[PDB]
Structure formats: structure tokens, C-alpha cells
Amino acid sequence: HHTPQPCQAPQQWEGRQVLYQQSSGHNNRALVSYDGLNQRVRVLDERKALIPCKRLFEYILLYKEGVMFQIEQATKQCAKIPLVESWDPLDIPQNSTFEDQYSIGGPQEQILVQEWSDRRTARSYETWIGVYTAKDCYPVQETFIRNYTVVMSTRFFDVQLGIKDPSVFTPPSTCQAAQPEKMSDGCS
Amino acid sequence: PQPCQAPQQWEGRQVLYQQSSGHNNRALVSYDGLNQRVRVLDERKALIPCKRLFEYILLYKEGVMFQIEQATKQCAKIPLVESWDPLDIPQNSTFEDQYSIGGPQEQILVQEWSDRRTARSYETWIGVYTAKDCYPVQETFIRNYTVVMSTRFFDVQLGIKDPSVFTPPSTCQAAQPEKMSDGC
Ligand SMILES: *[C@@H]1O[C@H](CO)[C@@H](O)[C@H](O)[C@H]1NC(C)=O
Ligand SMILES: *[C@@H]1O[C@H](CO)[C@@H](O)[C@H](O)[C@H]1NC(C)=O
Ligand SMILES: *[C@H]1O[C@H](CO)[C@@H](O)[C@H](O)[C@H]1NC(C)=O
């Protein structure tokens, strides 16, 4: 009945994430470091299971200087990928549409979250949906829609405030050399 | 870390996502695992293209599902081939992970359980439930490493407020045996 205003989402944190992509129907787990103050992000592929072997990479997205580095985890072999997209923080735009509010879990173990979108009233057209906790405004889930169809969804877990170690945003020595082509998911 | 016991009767709300369509479908849901029956009521955040809204009453002990159009109460009777699978963690699940959603003043712990057999390369089901009380959060079905569908649960209230919700309306005598189409 009453419509909240967007809380401010914390702009430096580390935790874990599961990124789902429509086009493959796959989930990818990863450690994540998010520094919205310096507009940089680091993502380290994680495995729960060894079941199909995949190569594992670490990504360092430095938006100020328009590059993302992909880095093979064991070998430290690199790839300099032009990152040309504009910075877009993980937060709730002041003009977001309040969609809904609900609880996850159940009585005695629960948390209220709020769902926010960019859908204009009386339009049915969404490109972005973001779910954040109601008190601390921690990020819970983020979804990108194209033609009424989900393109990717990310869930966030184990969010801790601050950056334990800013050097994670420093690419290894091998990345000046860095090639230009993006390496492949599989050992196969 | 040990499989908890999901409650066998509750009501709340869900979002079902399907890979084939890339769509989300929102519903109110009453889950009655004692009587092996579910009631799903399509709900709407917005008016998009025009989709008809249905209510489904799934009665597994009887082998049938009733599809009921919400305004007109027009009704189909469709047999239920799928046998009953409760929304719980089998006592033989593989523990996958544990993590928190939220932060200091507002945090819950959830556990992720699965189907996977380590060293035999298969997994068809992943379930997320809260650690202490075993409330259901998310359920995902998998085929060859690829998500088929996933449902998220919210606003879970214990119990069934009114068991009549599983009693279909009179019209469901008129056993139109074809499922009603999604379009207007
Ligand atoms: C402002 O908010 C609206 C959501 O109603 C969104 O559509 C629009 O893109 C936002 N403006 C920008 C992107 O600066
Ligand atoms: C967008 O959605 C509509 C309706 O579902 C579909 O007919 C259309 O083909 C889609 N767009 C594209 C580019 O295919
Ligand atoms: C473990 O036990 C069940 C039977 O209760 C068996 O059918 C199941 O497939 C096993 N776990 C899985 C799903 O791999």
C-alpha cells in the first residue's frame, strides 16, 4: 500500500555469486570483489564440483581504464579484452519502480527483500530487475531482460563489507604482454 | 551438516522460471505434503501481452490436476502422470554449500543440497533451504548440466489457512479434457 524509496547499496564488498546465462542454460559460481568507488570488479571462478572439467579464470574489470583481464587460474596466462561498456553500479537508481516486497525463508528465519525494476508505469517493458534486502540494502539478485526474456541472472551471497585486499584488483605481470583473444571454457 | 526436515504444510508465493521460454511465472501456492496436493494460483505484476490466468489444483492421490480459469471458473480435468515428489531434502542428498543472504542486522543462512553423485557425472536437482528451519527458498531441475526450470519461494507461512482451496468448483464436473490455451 505504501511504496518505499530506494535504499543506498554498499559500494565496496566481497562475497560469492552465481551467474546464470539464458543462452547456455548454465550456472557459473564465483568469488566476487566489488569496488564501485573505483569502478572495478574482480570475479574468480569457483567449483563446488569437479563433475565436468572446466578451465577456470579470474576476471578483473577496470572500467576507468576500459579493459577487462581474463586470467587462467593455474598458469596465469592472460587476455586483454577491451571493455567498452559504461560503468553501471550495483545499486538502485533513484527513479526505479518499486515492484514488490517479500520475505525469504519463513517465520523465525527470514529476511525481507525488495524488488525494484526499470519498468515505466503502464508499460510492460522491463530490462532490469534488482532484489535487495530491506534493512541493509545488500544485493540479493540481479536480472537483465531483453525481449520479455531473461538474458542473465546473478545471485549474491556471503556479502562482507569492505575489500580485504585491494591487490586482487592488480593484474599479474603477464597481463602487459596480454594477448587479445578470449580463452575457452573447457579442458575439452 | 545434515539434511533438515522441510515443513509439510505451508502457503506462500513462487516464481517459476523456464529455460525453454526464458520466462518467469508468478503464483500464490498452497503446498500440502500430508495430502500430496498443491494449489497454484497465477498472479500478475503487470498486464504485458494478454495472458489468461488459471488456478491449478493438483491431486496426486487421485491422479488428477484441475485447471480453472480464474474469472469464469471454466475447468479442464487432466490426468497427472508424474508421481508425488515432496518438496523436502531427501535424507540421502549430497551437501553442496552453505551461505548467507544479507548482512549484519538482517541475515539468514541457507544450504544447498543436491542430487549429484561425486565421480559419476550426474545431477538433476538442486534445492536451497534455510539452515535452521528448513524453509524452501529455491528448487532447480537440471539435465546434462543445463537448467530446465527453477522455482523460487517467498512469504512462506506454516499451515494451510483453509483446506477448501483444494476443493474444485462445481464446473469441474464438466470435465473438458483439453488444457486451456495460454492466449486470449
Ligand atoms: C530513470 O529511471 C527510469 C525508470 O522509471 C529508467 O527507465 C530510466 O532509464 C532512468 N534514467 C536513466 C537511465 O538515467
Ligand atoms: C519478441 O517477442 C515476441 C512475442 O513473444 C516474438 O514474437 C518476437 O519474435 C520476439 N523478438 C524477436 C527479435 O524474435
Ligand atoms: C539417492 O536415493 C534415492 C531414493 O530414495 C535415489 O532414487 C536417488 O536417485 C539417489 N540420489 C540421487 C537422486 O542421485
Residue numbers in the entry:
A (entry chain D): 36 to 223
B (entry chain A): 39 to 222
Which statements did the authors publish about this structure?
Orthologous proteins to ependymin called ependymin-related proteins (EPDRs) have been found to exist in various tissues from sea urchins to humans, yet their functional role remains to be revealed. All of the EPDR1s fold into a dimer using a monomeric subunit that is mostly made up of two stacking antiparallel β-sheets with a curvature on one side, resulting in the formation of a deep hydrophobic pocket. All six of the cysteine residues in the monomeric subunit participate in the formation of three intramolecular disulfide bonds. The EPDR1 fold is very similar to the folds of bacterial VioE and LolA/LolB, which also use a similar hydrophobic pocket for their respective functions as a hydrophobic substrate-binding enzyme and a lipoprotein carrier, respectively.
